[PDB]
Amino acid sequence: PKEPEQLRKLFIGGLSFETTDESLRSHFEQWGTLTDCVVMRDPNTKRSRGFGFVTYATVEEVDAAMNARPHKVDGRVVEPKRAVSREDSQRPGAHLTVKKIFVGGIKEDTEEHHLRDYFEQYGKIEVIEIMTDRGSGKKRGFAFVTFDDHDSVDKIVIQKYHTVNGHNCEVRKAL
């Protein structure tokens, strides 16, 4: 069946105030079937709030849209982000826009190439830090991976599971 709708939505910030439901749809339909497309407006003035959202039919279409960034919509470069699927209890509905993940549960036998070979298919990697003990140099069993862009992290933390070097890993957004 269909992927959950929350995982098919893109919040689009930085809209031109002239962008409409129709012009936002004409732009983003280039990368897939849109089941929803709305510009947020003031309830009294109808003036744009400067953001909106689009819902694609599939997650692959969301990927296609994010891979086609930067998006210039009605003359303005906009800021698409996947919808918050797991929120911070203290900042409900806020996207924590970061480029770095914590990867835990990798034990002492996981090396840099294990992490790179796995995570490079989510995005362009800039830093891999396998954490070692300050006193002994022994591996501590966790790592940080820094990407060049936040959408890689968003794709990663949406997954229920990550298997790296045969280990079932815990992955979360970092700093």
Ligand X SMILES: CC(=O)Nc1ccccc1O
Contacts to ligand X by CB under 6 A: 82, 84-88, 95-96, 154, 157-158
Q: How far is the CB of 72 from ligand X (least distance, A)?
A: 23
Judged by beta carbon, residue 15 or residue 66, the one nearer ligand X is: 66
Q: How far is the CB of 173 from ligand X (least distance, A)?
A: 6
Nearest Cα neighbor of 101 from 1, 163, 173 is 173
Element containing residue 13 per DSSP (H, E): strand 9-13
Task: Kindly report each contact of residues 153-162 with a partner whose C-beta sits within 8 Å and lies 24 or more positions away, as own/partner.
Answer: 153/98, 153/99, 153/100, 153/101, 153/122, 153/123, 154/81, 154/82, 155/63, 155/82, 155/122, 155/123, 156/101, 156/119, 156/122, 157/86, 157/101, 158/7, 158/82, 158/85, 162/103, 162/118
Q: How far is the CB of 155 from ligand X (least distance, A)?
A: 8
Q: How far is the CB of 118 from ligand X (least distance, A)?
A: 19
Judged by beta carbon, residue 57 or residue 84, the one nearer ligand X is: 84
Q: How far is the CB of 94 from ligand X (least distance, A)?
A: 7
Rounded Cα gap, residues 24 and 52, in angstroms = 9
Judged by beta carbon, residue 39 or residue 157, the one nearer ligand X is: 157
Judged by beta carbon, residue 95 or residue 140, the one nearer ligand X is: 95
Judged by beta carbon, residue 108 or residue 161, the one nearer ligand X is: 161
